[PDB]
């Protein structure tokens, strides 16, 4: 009829709504977890290992390197970590012709 002195063994619980998947079960809510997948960017063209890139505006590598009159980028840079070009620059080889080994120069 009565309940004397007791010791109960058990486990922790909390307000966590985190869910994981196992090889045997889906959508298992858990106390503590860790995300391994980066799904978010800052939306900015940052510096790389302390060095800024070379923004070319409306110029292509060709336009900038040949010195197309619409390309100048004022008092210019002397080191860059990578290059920033627009999907379709509008200022390149203003006088038509073939640029030899262009993809090679771009890489170098």
């Amino acid at each position: 009829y009565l309940l004397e002195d007791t010791i109960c063994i058990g486990y922790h619980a909390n307000n966590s709504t985190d869910t994981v998947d196992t090889v045997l079960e889906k959508n298992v809510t858990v106390t503590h977890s860790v995300n391994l997948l980066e799904d978010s960017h800052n939306g900015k063209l940052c510096l790389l290992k302390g060095i800024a890139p070379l923004q070319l505006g409306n110029c292509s590598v060709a336009g900038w390197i040949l010195g197309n009159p619409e390309c100048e980028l004022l008092i210019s840079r002397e080191s860059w970590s990578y290059i920033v070009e627009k999907p379709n620059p509008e200022n390149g080889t203003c006088y038509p012709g073939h640029f030899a080994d262009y993809e090679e120069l771009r890489e170098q």
């Binding site: 309940l3 004397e4 002195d5 007791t6 010791i7 109960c8 063994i9 058990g10 486990y11 922790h12 619980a13 909390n14 994981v20 998947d21 196992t22 090889v23 045997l24 079960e25 298992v28 106390t31 860790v34 391994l36 290992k49 990578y82 262009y102 993809e103 771009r106 890489e107």
Partner: protein
């Protein structure tokens, strides 16, 4: 054990992962077993660090640009890029699924073992009543209680003291 014979978890225990709940003449309390908890915390952390830190990457520019007379190289390069994504996506997805099951199984085996510790000391000086609950056949003080926890529990000091209330 976890969602098995011990149906749920304690929102009352905030000092650990696995532990105990005692009630006596002095009062009731939630106490986490700091030895099984720490070894589980350290162990899991190690698993996680291994998954993250083992991935070491050097500086690399993935992209390659080709001309209209370099379609084979362009495709060779796509084959590389895609083959690596295929491998990492499969491996990563499967590793997480496998070791998440392993982690969950590991906790279960720790609570089943924490239970067996208490069952081993309190041979017939207590009764298996609820889930992971044990019902003392003797008067277990805030002293005897905190002694079941650190495993230094004295079976004889309460062996005969239990026998009286036992046969009844």
């Amino acid at each position: 054990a976890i969602a098995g014979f011990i149906e749920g978890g304690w929102t009352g225990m905030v000092d650990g992962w696995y532990g105990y709940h005692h009630q006596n003449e002095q009062g009731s309390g939630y106490a986490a077993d700091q030895k099984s908890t720490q070894n589980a915390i350290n162990g899991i952390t190690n698993k996680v660090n291994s998954v993250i830190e083992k991935m070491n990457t050097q500086f690399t520019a993935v992209g390659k640009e080709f001309n209209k007379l370099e379609r084979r190289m362009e495709n060779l390069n796509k084959k590389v890029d895609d083959g690596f994504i295929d491998i990492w996506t499969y491996n990563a997805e499967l590793l997480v699924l496998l070791e998440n099951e392993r982690t969950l199984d590991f906790h279960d085996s720790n609570v089943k073992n924490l239970y067996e510790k208490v069952k081993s000391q309190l041979k017939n000086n207590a009764k298996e009543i609820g889930n992971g609950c044990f019902e003392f056949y003797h008067k277990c003080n805030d002293e005897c209680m905190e002694s079941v926890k650190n495993g230094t529990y004295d079976y004889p000091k309460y062996s005969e003291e239990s026998k009286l209330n036992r046969e009844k």
